[PDB]
Paper text:
Here, we demonstrate that Rv3722c is the primary aspartate aminotransferase (AspAT) in Mtb, non-redundantly catalyzes the specific biosynthesis of Asp in vitro, and is essential for axenic growth and survival of Mtb in macrophages and in mice. The overall fold of Rv3722c is similar to that of other members of the recently described type Ic subgroup of PLP-binding proteins.
Upon binding Kyn, however, we observed that the side chain of this residue is positioned more inward (by ~12 Å measured from the Cζ atom) and interacts with Kyn. This ligand-induced conformational change is reminiscent of the so called “arginine switch” observed in type Ia AspATs, although here the Arg residue moves toward the substrate rather than away. In our structure, we observed a sharp peak of a water molecule in close proximity to both the active site Lys257 and the PLP-KYN intermediate. We speculate that this is the same water molecule responsible for the generation of the keto acid Kyna, from the PLP-KYN intermediate. When compared with Kyn, the carboxylate moiety of Kyna is rotated by ~180° and faces the entrance of the solvent-exposed binding pocket. Interestingly, in all the Kyna-bound chains, Arg36 adopts its original “outward” conformation, most likely facilitating the release of the product.
Residue numbers in the entry:
A (entry chain A), B (entry chain B): 2 to 424
Amino acid sequence: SFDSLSPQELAALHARHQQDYAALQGMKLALDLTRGKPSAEQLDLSNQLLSLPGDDYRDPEGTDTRNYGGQHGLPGLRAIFAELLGIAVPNLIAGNNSSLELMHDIVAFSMLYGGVDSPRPWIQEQDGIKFLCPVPGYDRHFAITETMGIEMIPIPMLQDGPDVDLIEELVAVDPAIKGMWTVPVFGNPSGVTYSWETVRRLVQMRTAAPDFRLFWDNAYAVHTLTLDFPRQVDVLGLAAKAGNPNRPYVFASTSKITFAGGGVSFFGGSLGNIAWYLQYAGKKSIGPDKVNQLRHLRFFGDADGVRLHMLRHQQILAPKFALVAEVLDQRLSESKIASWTEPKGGYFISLDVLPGTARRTVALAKDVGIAVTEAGASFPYRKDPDDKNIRIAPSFPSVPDLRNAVDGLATCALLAATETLLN
Amino acid sequence: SFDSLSPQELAALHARHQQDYAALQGMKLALDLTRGKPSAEQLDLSNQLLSLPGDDYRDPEGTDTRNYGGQHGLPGLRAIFAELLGIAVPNLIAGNNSSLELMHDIVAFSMLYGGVDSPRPWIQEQDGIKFLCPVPGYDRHFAITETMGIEMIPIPMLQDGPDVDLIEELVAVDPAIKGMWTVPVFGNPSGVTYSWETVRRLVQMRTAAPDFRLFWDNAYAVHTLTLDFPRQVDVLGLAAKAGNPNRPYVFASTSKITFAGGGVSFFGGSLGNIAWYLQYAGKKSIGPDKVNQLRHLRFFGDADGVRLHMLRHQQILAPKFALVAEVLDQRLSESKIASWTEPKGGYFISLDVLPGTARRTVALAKDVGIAVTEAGASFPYRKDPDDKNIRIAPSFPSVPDLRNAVDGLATCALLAATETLLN
Ligand SMILES: Cc1ncc(COP(=O)(O)O)c(/C=N/[C@@H](CC(=O)c2ccccc2N)C(=O)O)c1O
Ligand SMILES: Cc1ncc(COP(=O)(O)O)c(CN)c1O
Ligand SMILES: O=C(O)c1cc(O)c2ccccc2n1
């Protein structure tokens, strides 16, 4: 254990780490733990999509999916995800291949036009616009707010959601706070799922801004690492009962169900928000790709079809997550320099190494050929005040590559730890 | 000859037309000439896309199209349209199913961020922003500028392009004019193709705004109604020789080549404009749908494959355009109340009836069950100052429906003419 270590014991331990690191570099590795994309083996599960939908190009309504028209998306596919998400079909639309693009356009519409009940477009707010950002969180959420000039306020994540006490306090006195980024199930990468009590408070709390929005990015809605699927909290129902029906914007995607970048996105909200979004989305496109929505409807068949498909993903992913946890445990637990999540779903593991050493750890790994996500990536402005957090993405590499990559990463974290202790 | 006539005879002809209109009212019609979309017969030409790409999900470069990554689009598909458009592959990207969406986002980026060489974002221009709009023009272009609060200035269309003399005088002295909408080949709905000399002048003219842009929406680039395809003028090359390389934004689409709403879009520009667009598009999406780009590349094979496919469209469309022309000629020519285009390509015929009667003509047709595009639809703010222009969309209906609909429209146009003449 490294808080109990003598001065000689630390110098010798640092020396052993130096040899481990020397040995590691001599292996000339070329490994990568940085992107959360499905493995080829996962993608193969959806290869039937590559020959679908075949000659019958009509959906169950009789719609010719090959021709212009229809902003809402195919109702038959929406009905499947309506069940999975617990959102009524009229409150859910299906888009193109990117939920991020839906999230981006909603922010852009808010800047240029204002939301459905905004006093003015957000670009006209002379004191600027703020979003609350539970951390660790999703760097592509932060990039959207950063690029639009929206200030980001980081919020600690707790076991069953973010720090709602803190959130409630900020929004009570600051009318400039217009939004909050969330991934409310198996968060990227905390792995935290918001409890019902957390959700109830977030949709009931009084906000100084009358048009405050929850960006409810349910990217991992069905993405279990066990054989159970999580119950979806009824965020839209709770918000309406609280008198804030327009507050949540719900997003989902099949990027990690079928093809990453070749899937279908979803947006859910109040009827007022659906009409608001479609009014402005109609200036941008005649409508989404109905053929790809038809392929997905034919492939899935129904919601049980999606569930069955997700357990097939789970059987591939779960051993990779178990391996990462075991390796971190065997290399790091005794030193007590680190801690990590053991998620029940989602695509990431969040590792905290010794404070003050995360950047160094990442740099050490890069010079032995192990690519590790940049330090601070899960924080707005890439600013991790403790310089401790590293994201690990287990999905893509083979099991043997994953073992080599995480064992090397652990070697780098230990040497970085002894380096800082000696100073 | 209506305009030279004899008052009881004018009254008698009006009585004649009324009998024609009563007859039309009997036939209990339900017809529609408003839909600029491919017929089901045209869409059938591309039904093999519904089973593509099949088992081989890799492009020629080995890219797994089922997984994340890559903003430019598949190089093999870009190479086909690079040849068709005369734009080098690095200067052309392929998007999702909507070129309109590319145009919208570029305008949105210009408002929020400014273009690559703008002095400031357009939303920071205290005197506002204007676009030049050749008329008749594309209403969805006008909807983008209208929704963004960009003032539109209509420009008369002439035989070989818009009124370049007028355009040159406006842009030289007004720094608020930032852009011009164009459809430079087979314009929607004028059918006018910009001449080589016109293109040359538009890319050389001095503009008061240093970041003036030509929105070069080449929607109908290969969409001939004869057995020959137009030359593509090298707008990007000519602009670069003029010292204005950033001036043109080129757009294209397969919406009327393969599936309308299920095709692939394209954006072309200087290397600076490509990098500028992708920088901000990268905040919106991880990237476009490579699998649909793969289906199109596999379906088309090469540029000659696209050309032959377009000739298959021409065989379906040309008799429909010929029928409309034949009916208008036989019913309206003697009266001299009207004139219409005879386009060599594109999707529309532009009809001018007697000035002051277009709104009435449309109402009369609707009241006998013939839906006709509303007066002013091809003008910014829906303002046709002469109340004469009607757009005809020949592509969608069957030959018998097209014949009945255009013949009905003529009766309404004739009846509307005699009404105003007696008044
Ligand atoms: C919470 C949340 N919301 C939306 C999305 C995007 O989903 P859409 O495809 O529908 O737009 C995500 C996805 N995250 C992944 C994927 C990712 O970034 C990535 C980026 C570049 C190259 C490869 C990649 N694998 C990651 O963080 O690595 C996400 O976690
Ligand atoms: C001139 C023009 N530009 C753009 C578009 C939009 O095409 P897309 O389907 O690629 O958005 C159309 C529709 N045919 C059009 O006529
Ligand atoms: O939904 C539509 O029917 C629609 C909308 C458009 O902008 C079109 C443009 C060109 C051609 C057909 C079009 N059709």
